[PDB]
Write a protein that binds this ligand. Structure first.
Ligand SMILES: *[C@@H]1O[C@H](CO)[C@@H](O)[C@H](O)[C@H]1NC(C)=O
Lengths: 49, 49
């Protein structure tokens, strides 16, 4: 409170000096679901090219 | 909660920190209206049964 009040003699009272929040740590991301596969085996391992 | 965005605020000065005091400035006196319109008596009276 002293830094924000710019004084060393603070009076008896309530003083809001800063704010706090919880910082995320892992940040998980699970959107996808593997589907609609287009065969690359039909162009890589086809018998005749 | 953007670090680089906050840097843009420092060079812009002390606007929002000033109004935060103003908002608390109205808030503290907001409750001050209550005791001067309700707490006009220091004796709490209970009605007889
Ligand atoms: C084709 O077969 C080879 C050998 O098994 C394999 O390494 C390759 O990944 C295959 N290609 C595809 C996309 O099926």
């Amino acid at each position: 409170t002293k830094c924000t009040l710019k004084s060393f003699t603070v009076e008896k009272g309530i003083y809001q000096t800063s704010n706090f929040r919880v910082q995320p740590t892992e940040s998980i991301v699970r959107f996808p679901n593997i589907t609609n596969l287009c065969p690359f085996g039909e162009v890589f391992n086809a018998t005749r090219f | 909660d953007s670090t680089e965005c906050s840097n843009l605020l420092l060079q812009y000065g002390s606007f929002c920190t000033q109004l935060n005091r103003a908002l608390t400035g109205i808030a503290v006196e907001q409750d001050k209206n209550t005791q001067e319109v309700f707490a006009q008596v220091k004796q709490i009276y209970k009605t007889p049964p």
